[PDB]
Motif scaffolding. Structure first.
Motif, mmCIF file in Angstrom:
data_model
loop_
_atom_site.group_PDB
_atom_site.id
_atom_site.type_symbol
_atom_site.label_atom_id
_atom_site.label_comp_id
_atom_site.label_asym_id
_atom_site.label_seq_id
_atom_site.Cartn_x
_atom_site.Cartn_y
_atom_site.Cartn_z
ATOM 1 N N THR A 561 11.648 -5.251 -1.274
ATOM 2 C CA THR A 561 11.181 -6.071 -2.363
ATOM 3 C C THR A 561 10.940 -7.491 -1.851
ATOM 4 O O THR A 561 11.861 -8.138 -1.342
ATOM 5 C CB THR A 561 12.193 -6.062 -3.507
ATOM 6 O OG1 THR A 561 12.116 -4.803 -4.201
ATOM 7 C CG2 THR A 561 11.894 -7.201 -4.468
ATOM 8 N N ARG A 594 1.796 -0.922 -1.729
ATOM 9 C CA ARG A 594 2.464 -1.601 -2.809
ATOM 10 C C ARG A 594 2.866 -0.594 -3.898
ATOM 11 O O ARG A 594 2.139 0.333 -4.165
ATOM 12 C CB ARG A 594 1.478 -2.640 -3.306
ATOM 13 C CG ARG A 594 1.847 -3.369 -4.552
ATOM 14 C CD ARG A 594 0.876 -4.498 -4.816
ATOM 15 N NE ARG A 594 1.123 -5.667 -3.975
ATOM 16 C CZ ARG A 594 0.369 -6.040 -2.954
ATOM 17 N NH1 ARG A 594 -0.698 -5.333 -2.594
ATOM 18 N NH2 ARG A 594 0.700 -7.144 -2.294
ATOM 19 N N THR A 596 4.832 -1.947 -6.929
ATOM 20 C CA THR A 596 4.757 -2.724 -8.170
ATOM 21 C C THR A 596 3.621 -3.717 -8.057
ATOM 22 O O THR A 596 3.323 -4.202 -6.979
ATOM 23 C CB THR A 596 6.058 -3.500 -8.451
ATOM 24 O OG1 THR A 596 6.327 -4.414 -7.365
ATOM 25 C CG2 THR A 596 7.207 -2.511 -8.627
ATOM 26 N N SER A 636 6.053 -8.253 -4.963
ATOM 27 C CA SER A 636 5.763 -6.841 -4.912
ATOM 28 C C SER A 636 6.895 -6.052 -4.256
ATOM 29 O O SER A 636 7.608 -6.519 -3.375
ATOM 30 C CB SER A 636 4.489 -6.593 -4.091
ATOM 31 O OG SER A 636 3.314 -7.020 -4.735
ATOM 32 N N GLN A 637 7.009 -4.823 -4.706
ATOM 33 C CA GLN A 637 7.796 -3.822 -4.041
ATOM 34 C C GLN A 637 6.842 -2.998 -3.215
ATOM 35 O O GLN A 637 5.904 -2.382 -3.746
ATOM 36 C CB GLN A 637 8.465 -2.926 -5.065
ATOM 37 C CG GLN A 637 9.860 -3.361 -5.449
ATOM 38 C CD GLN A 637 10.430 -2.431 -6.481
ATOM 39 O OE1 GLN A 637 10.271 -1.194 -6.397
ATOM 40 N NE2 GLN A 637 11.060 -3.014 -7.494
ATOM 41 N N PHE C 575 5.780 5.450 -10.239
ATOM 42 C CA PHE C 575 6.541 4.229 -10.072
ATOM 43 C C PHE C 575 7.845 4.262 -10.799
ATOM 44 O O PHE C 575 8.670 3.357 -10.648
ATOM 45 C CB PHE C 575 5.684 3.106 -10.530
ATOM 46 C CG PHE C 575 4.341 3.212 -9.967
ATOM 47 C CD1 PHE C 575 4.085 2.744 -8.715
ATOM 48 C CD2 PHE C 575 3.399 3.930 -10.604
ATOM 49 C CE1 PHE C 575 2.858 2.923 -8.124
ATOM 50 C CE2 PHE C 575 2.164 4.123 -10.030
ATOM 51 C CZ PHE C 575 1.889 3.604 -8.790
ATOM 52 N N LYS C 583 9.055 7.957 -5.470
ATOM 53 C CA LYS C 583 8.288 6.750 -5.767
ATOM 54 C C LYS C 583 7.211 6.693 -4.695
ATOM 55 O O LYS C 583 7.530 6.429 -3.549
ATOM 56 C CB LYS C 583 9.210 5.541 -5.690
ATOM 57 C CG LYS C 583 8.776 4.343 -6.486
ATOM 58 C CD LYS C 583 9.890 3.756 -7.352
ATOM 59 C CE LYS C 583 11.085 3.222 -6.552
ATOM 60 N NZ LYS C 583 12.299 3.124 -7.447
ATOM 61 N N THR C 605 -4.034 -3.340 -5.349
ATOM 62 C CA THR C 605 -3.021 -3.684 -6.336
ATOM 63 C C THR C 605 -3.388 -3.123 -7.681
ATOM 64 O O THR C 605 -4.364 -2.384 -7.787
ATOM 65 C CB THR C 605 -2.770 -5.187 -6.421
ATOM 66 O OG1 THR C 605 -1.793 -5.458 -7.444
ATOM 67 C CG2 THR C 605 -4.054 -5.929 -6.678
#
Lengths: 644, 644, 642
Positions: A561, A594, A596, A636-637, C575, C583, C605
């Motif tokens: 993280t 990524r 999150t 970001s995670q 997620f 995940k 993203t």
């Protein structure tokens, strides 16, 4: 009366007034029923005996038996004509060569043996045709693939069902051919037709080379010996060496079609474990077509087990066993030191053969021959290589080689690209696969217990598994620096570390450019910083292209993280950033993704690779890298995976 | 006395004094010892001769010999009963068909021949059982994998050790089955048990289909001919064409079990080179189980070498040699134009067979048949394909096609997924493998010297190596635009540039979408900007997904050092940014990894790809790209590698 | 002219004299000589008569029809160097023993029908172990061409055999009974010097014969060169006459024993349960021997049993129906004392088993160099193939509809190798090698619950379809077994309406990070490519490179605008944080196609996944490419992987 009966042969032969209708019977070791006649008959003292007034002819259908015959000479005589079926049911003591002719069968019972002369080391069985006595030229070029050849009408008489021998001055092209042997082939005539002053002869099988007029392509009528079957031939016997009883070549064939040799045993044309004698092959096929050897056992042989040479086409060797021979099987060249030679073998199959303790390669070819295949053959304890290819593109499927003094499988000087598919090499001293002479194709193979799994200069190593190699699993090298290095692709190989050698060894000493190699998707787990071995470099060389290989199995995946667009991660990330000559400058590929999606998402990068330096032993679990974001607010995670 | 000896047949048949206790002998070309009787006896003028008062019986142990019979008619009479062992040791002149029955052995000496009738072209040997006269329905449904079937008690008498014929109105499912052939199977009864008015019959082998009552599943007792062996049959002889001596079908078997044919030669039921004649197969197996052909040679055959049809199960063909035939081996369908038909071949194996100069495919199936395998078979110089698969999922192992007029290996209209493993195609005109009709699985194959290596519309091309293909190595296309494109995976294939065609060819003309292809880890070395060939597109299509392929082997790995966030690198980076219809928009995948870790480290990217445009020929070593960091102060040392 | 009308007559004539012409008419027909020299009566070739005996005169083989009864046949065959043709239906009441250099040949008519009164053995080919051993003079390492013994210690005659053994344990597999090593070798060279004899062997030694292991050697008595041509043992209908036997053909210490074709039926009732030790053919300490083409029906035990130090054994083209195991390599129970010998170098090829009460093709836990090539098993009550010794290799084998697994190893068994093997409709799985790893190369499994069960090793290549649970199930036989590295590379695990791609078994301690999935086709599984169960904490996923998950919306070109672009594609991921889930997110490969001055570093993203109902539409998933330079206006090519 009219009934004559004798208790020995001397009696029957001595009777002086045999009548053409007597009932004649012989009682004893060679007994049976005979018929008197004055017809001229070939005496052999087995089936035909001379007597006052004429001959005695044995009455029988089916095959003849050796136990009918007074001596080896009679045997020889009897077999000198075609269409003869003999059953060797006794122990014959040879004092000359036995020639077999067309449509003949020599069959051994379990008791039968032909024992070689102890006074003269010579040949035992000859199956012998002969080269044509005159050639005529082809009236036009005949390309590879042709079904028909043409000659001038009247030039020769092409009889349907017989054979033809063709040749030109074009060189054989199976392999390097350094003796410059010329092309030839044997074909059968299945169709003939004349028109407009040219005869067209249709062959059974198509031509495998270009037969041009510029190469003096000609053709002639060979005298072939055809349809011979040797069933379970037993040549010589154990203990021959205490009688000093030898032979040269066991079964020698030349110009034979449909010669089939089934089982049997051939022993001792050399002393046990003794050294080799040039030419002493157990079985020799020279210019043989459609001929095979199946299940024969060979022991203590001076030269090759089975030798295949000349334009021998469609030859199969099945299920043989050979122990203490120079080569179990060898496809040979011909020395042209004494003039021109024609023929390389074409279409050869070796399947399910076993060789033990050969003084040279177990299974071998010389530098000519086309379409050679070895299937499920195995070599044990060879004094040289398990398998040796000296002609181009030999194919091996599922072959095995154990404990060869040198290499399990190998090519040689100037030989090009053998193909090994799912071949296994175990405990051969030097390497499993040695094809550094001019590339190879090593597909799904395995090598265990050698100095190096594979010695290669170019080609492909695809799949397979390598272990217990003291130096390295793959060794990129050449036989001599003058040989060219070419592209090498190493894809999907298991080259794991097991406490011995490294994964890959690049031989700078002989001019190896590592960038000419690509390593993709290989399991190099456990070698840590020592996956590569380099030697002979004077300048640090660029490494090979390397995509998604495995180097470690722990701390090679995770989630971090970010905090102010940074995160330190403990993983088994590795690399060398030094500049020693014999070494690479490299580093782990770290795949980032990524998980999150904050609004401060920036572009990810790996920086600050740190490697734990503990003593005496470093601990890779303390290596670390940093994930940095192009946005300094990033939180970001990020998932990470470590590759090589 | 009490023995009577003659000097020929004619005498021995005339003498009227024969009595049940005489010892009788005969001198001459069919001599022997006889025993008179007056029981009934079938005359053959071989082993049974009609005489005043009764018949003379030849007494012998072992087999009979053709040389004892007066004519072909008695031979035929003799073999018409089961349990016969006859040795053909002479040249027989046939004038009718010869039927072989159960437990009989026909065996040829090197001399023996059967010459067909020059007056009437007819069949030579028949081995003929018969379908059942009546059927009874199944008492219940019997799923694939059933060991047992049921019928109503007393419906039929199932005798252990005999066979049964099962059938239903379900359609054969092996392939397209366009004639709508229906299922049938033959089974041996090995267990029987009756209980509650329902008999349970145990089979030797399980059922390979679902036999449902809704499909009229029924069963009856075929009459089988079983345990017949032909040893070295020689039918016809070279020069037949000059005597206009032919035959139709050489060896025809229907409803046979354990028919084994060993070696032999079958020649000319057509003229050499001549055109084909429908139905003149040399060997035909219709509704045969566990039957085989091994090592037979076929010359000049109007139809198929070995024709396999019906519900022939577990048939094997080994080591045959077929020269000048339509198909060396063909699994056939049955035309339903004149009625319903039953049975597709189930479990077939062809191994180590050689075909030369076939008028049609060397090895062929029609559109029915399940579990069909070809192992190490080879075709030379076909007029059509080397191999033709017209039923689904035909499997080829290590097969070879040389110089076919069309494709080495091909499927056909509406045929689905043949599977090719390590098969090699050399110098076939159109293509190596043509499986564009409905997908293919091409595994570790090789095709050289065609227009295109592989034509495929969907499936996979995994590994293998392709060279010397004028148009492209892989050609993504379809037989016809109506046929559906499916996913195509091309992984680990060697498609290097060698001065001929391109790597892949996408056929816009028949609706090929390139994004349904993934190319991964292939060797496309040397094609530069011309790795793809497109045609027939009106609009620039999107390219396929491409992962880590190789396009050049020079200038494809190095280290650069940034200066104020940037560096210009000279490398064989490549791409097309044009918008022409028949082309892709694409660019190299440049892998970047950092090697020194300044505090100014930023995210890396590639930009400014530039490609040298020298004339007449461009020099890609002057191509270049730029590495730029998101941090304008970056002075990292970045390693780079160039892929496609 | 001494001519008789039948047997009895020929044997009552007191007048036979040294040199007459004797002839017999009738079913036993032939010609005879007279003599007083001791001869062994058998009422076929040798006859007892007032004054001495009558000898049948013949060359070639002898015929069963010549013999008065089963007993003479047995007498006849009890000497070596015999050739007999069984051209009649023989009714056995004893065991027939065959000796060296013999051949028993059946015509299409010949049969040996077993005794209905007693179930016993039918044919025996038996030699015997050495009566005495002497120790080796020095250690002989694997690969030795030679062994040494003290001079005078034993007489090694060239051409004969030796039986060597030591207390070393056989090493082919787990060898739980602790069987010890032995091997049989042929002497091909002998030489004495300095009080030590050096014996040269035909083939090399495959183990270490150490002195510390009491390596010793002795002279077995072998039966050599026996050929059985088309033996017919029993006949259909046997069960209605209650006619059985125990072992059909049983061999021990035989060399070059060859059985060709033939049929062997009914040492058990049809479909009945098994009877221990009732194998049709049994090879014990046999060398260079083979079985080709023989058919087996209704066998209580195994079709071909191979045990002891049988070396270089091959079985080809056999067909076995209703048998326990068509072929089995066996161990030896040591419950009642020490045992020597594992098979070494065994080839099974093109063999067919139908309806076996147990595995179609099996080994027990000893055995070296075992190969099955193109064999096939149909409808086994257990597995099609079971490997219980280490490194068994299968080439192109097929298993259809086995009650359990198409192919399996077992408890404590290590890495069987499967090459291009095909598994169709086996209930439980196609390949089950979760006991100690497996190497599963370009294989195929269709119609099981799981394609492959495996704890470690490799699945490379191949294709899997119609597996209700998953194509590849990463699991153990028992939690105590270790999980090792597993590589799954290049495998086609496409979704087809049934199971998922991979199933990770948390319940038995499977850690998925020890698995790498590279270049696989997992097309159509969407969010459900993986199955997890038994996890209490969300585990980290396996390493994944460039796999395929969808075949639509997976490549395009996008145009940046002020550093960003929203792409509609089949990008995916989870997620969440459910224990039984990963995940993960799609790998999106980005390459630049236009190079504006504003070019910056790219990143993916804001992954969004359409949530429509009842069914989501993945074509409305989207992600965002973003540059580090806000001015960036690049055209960016994108490809979507897993």
């Amino acid at each position: 009366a009219p009934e004559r009966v004798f208790s020995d042969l001397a009696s029957m032969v001595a009777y002086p007034n045999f009548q053409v209708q007597d009932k004649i019977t012989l009682l004893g070791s060679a007994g049976g029923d005979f018929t008197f006649t004055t017809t001229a008959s070939v005496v052999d003292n087995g089936t035909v005996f001379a007597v006052p007034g004429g001959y005695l002819l044995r009455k029988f259908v089916g095959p003849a038996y050796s136990s009918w015959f007074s001596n080896w000479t009679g045997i020889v005589t009897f077999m000198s004509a075609p269409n003869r079926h003999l059953v060797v049911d006794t122990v014959l003591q040879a004092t000359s060569v036995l020639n077999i002719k067309s449509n003949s069968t020599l069959e051994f019972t379990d008791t039968g043996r032909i024992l070689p002369d102890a006074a003269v080391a010579r040949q035992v069985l000859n199956i012998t045709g002969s080269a044509p006595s005159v050639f005529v030229p082809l009236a036009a070029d005949a390309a590879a693939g042709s079904k028909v050849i043409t000659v001038a009408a009247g030039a020769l008489s092409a009889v349907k069902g017989t054979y033809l021998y063709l040749r030109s001055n074009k060189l054989c092209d199976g392999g390097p051919n350094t003796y410059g042997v010329k092309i030839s082939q044997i074909r059968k005539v299945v169709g003939v037709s004349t028109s407009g002053g040219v005869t067209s002869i249709r062959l059974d099988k198509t031509l495998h080379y270009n037969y041009y007029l510029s190469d003096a392509a000609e053709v002639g009528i060979p005298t072939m010996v055809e349809n011979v079957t040797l069933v379970s031939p037993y040549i010589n016997e154990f203990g021959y060496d205490d009688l000093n009883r030898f032979f040269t070549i066991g079964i020698s064939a030349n110009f034979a079609a449909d010669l089939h040799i089934q089982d049997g045993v051939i022993i001792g044309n050399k002393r046990p474990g003794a050294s080799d004698i040039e030419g002493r092959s157990a079985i020799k096929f020279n210019n043989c077509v459609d001929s095979t050897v199946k299940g024969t056992c060979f022991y203590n042989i001076g030269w090759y087990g089975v030798e295949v040479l000349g334009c021998s086409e469609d030859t199969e060797v099945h299920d043989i066993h050979a122990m203490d021979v120079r080569h179990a099987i060898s496809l040979n060249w011909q020395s042209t030191a004494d003039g021109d030679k024609w023929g390389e073998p074409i279409e050869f199959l070796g399947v399910n053969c076993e060789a033990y303790s050969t003084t040279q390669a177990g299974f071998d070819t010389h530098d000519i021959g086309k379409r050679v295949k070895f299937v499920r053959c195995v070599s044990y304890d060879s004094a040289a290589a398990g398998f040796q290819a000296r002609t181009n593109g030999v194919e091996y499927l599922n072959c095995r080689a154990y404990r060869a003094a040198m290499d399990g499988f190998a090519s040689n000087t100037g030989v090009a690209f053998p193909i090994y598919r799912e071949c296994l090499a175990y405990d051969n001293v030097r390497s499993g696969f040695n094809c550094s002479y001019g590339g190879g194709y090593v597909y799904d193979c395995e090598a265990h217990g050698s100095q190096n799994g594979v010695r290669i200069n170019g080609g492909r190593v695809k799949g397979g598994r390598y272990t217990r190699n003291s130096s390295s699993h793959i060794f990129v090298t050449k036989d001599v620096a003058e040989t060219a290095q070419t592209s090498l692709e190493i894809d999907g190989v298991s080259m794991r570390y097991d406490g011995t050698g490294r994964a890959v060894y690049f031989h700078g000493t002989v001019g190896i450019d590592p960038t000419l190699v690509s390593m993709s998707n290989n399991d190099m787990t456990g070698h840590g910083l020592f996956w590569a071995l380099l030697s002979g470099y004077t300048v640090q060389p660029t490494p090979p292209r390397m995509s998604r290989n495995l180097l470690d199995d722990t701390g090679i995946r995770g989630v971090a993280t970010l905090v102010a667009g940074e995160a330190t991660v403990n993983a088994r990330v590795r690399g060398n950033f030094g500049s020693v000559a014999n070494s690479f400058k490299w580093v782990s590929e770290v795949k980032l993704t990524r998980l999150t999606f904050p609004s401060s998402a920036g572009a990810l990068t790996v920086t600050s690779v740190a490697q734990n330096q503990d003593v005496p032993t470093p601990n890779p679990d303390l290596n670390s890298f940093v994930i940095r974001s192009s946005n300094a607010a990033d939180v970001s995670q990020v998932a990470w995976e470590v590759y090589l």
